[PDB]
Amino acid sequence: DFAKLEEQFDAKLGIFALDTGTNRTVAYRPDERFAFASTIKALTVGVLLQQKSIEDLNQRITYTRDDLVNYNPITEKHVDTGMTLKELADASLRYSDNAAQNLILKQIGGPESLKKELRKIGDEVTNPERFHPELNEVNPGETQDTSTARALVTSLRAFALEDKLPSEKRELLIDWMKRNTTGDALIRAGVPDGWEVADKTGAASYGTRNDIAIIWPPKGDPVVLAVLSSRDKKDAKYDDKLIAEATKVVMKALNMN
Template sequence: MIDPEGDPVFRRLSLALLTLAALTSCATPATPTTPAPAATVTQPDFAALEKTFGARLGVYAIDTGTGREIAYHADDRFAYASTHKVFTAAAILHRGDDLHRMITVRSSDLVPYSPITEKHLDTGMSLQSVLDAALRYSDNTAGNLMFREIGGPEGLTADLHRSGDTVTHVDRIEPALNDTAPGDIRDTTTPRAWAADLRAAVLGSALGPDRQAVLTGMMRASTTGGNLIRAGVPDGWQVADKTGTADYATRNDIAVVWPPNRAPIVLAVLSDRPQKDAKADDKLIAQATAAVVKVLP
């Protein structure tokens, strides 16, 4: 639960996030800032998973220590859904805004699935609380408040272009961006492009260590991904992830995963089904992840 600015619980969370950079430097191996050369590995049988779940699957993973990569439908388009919140938050952090600045939450701002912001209509929220609500709880109003800070979809497009991503289409805000359909390129990306953006945000140098620690700390504390990538990695591996859900059983998870005593793996797993009202199955993402880590041990 997000507490308003001034609450001692919030202050402890803020302190923990801002000191995570120092802890991370001790707990995880150094990561190259430039991609290692790609190396061929045995590709898992993702087609069998697609058949089992009646779904379309897109996977891109790279071991940042060895350069080994796994790609399956990695350049096909998928609706990104709420996974955008990582990059919308990163755009705010890159600007260097005051994270303690209070943000007004109006009743007219509220959209479906806003479990945190709906509690702050009278008190408002700090900018850091808004980011936290979006990343840890996938709060949709918080997602839109972040969009408002950076100038809407156009602002996120500009920030992605700055990092070299000219593939992703950013067109709408929450919840309209989840209204997807086969062949609609609005609010879509590819597993390869999204993984590259995630690597730049979490492991690159653009944000600086303190701001990067805020982003990564919130992703590590996510409450929405327990049955997805987190369920597909061995015990003891650290995961910083962001999930997403949309029409046509779109179910996504993107993550940076830290195996013990090794460089991190960056992973994007995106999926959907051909029927608009089909139900997503988190086991597809978990099993695809397990297949990845089996060949990138």
């Protein structure tokens, strides 16, 4: 079924899913690298949370037009007032605000700092190097700003569900991701209505289209999923339907739907 989706959508798919209740997995090219694009924003907030108290998220960040980049849906409205770190995390996660990601990344010490903190949580794969807009531009074979489906799942799980954060911080992260506005055509579109989904989307050059998520069936332990994709041509379009359909194959394979 994954090969058939690659054929229908002229794309390369990377899939990893873990049922945290059983330890069963679904995998298809799970260790192939893709540009992570804005899926990195979830791990970036994980690191922010780890390094701050919750009250410390109330720090107000002043910024200017020079901090705004290519896509600033929330941050462009608040240049005059600033935004708190909490507000920047909300913007980054729920709207994929690129300026918010760059401001958070600067607060935590820049891409190299983020990389060091990911290594500390056990991720030796994810390779943050650049800010937006450049991080979304990755050529075939390059490893800058890439990860794999397996590593993104492992890292997302570690922050949201395991012991890289204390419970109140896990809850912030999960609630922001559950209320994401950008993912309705992706993993959410392959999950029955009513099941809670926390997700973060991304897109990059070479038609890269990604979504990472935690899916809660009405009872029982959650599934952590990464669906990554890319194409042959630099300026290629993506199709969200590939990601929705891949998700439905994962849900069948896990006997959840």
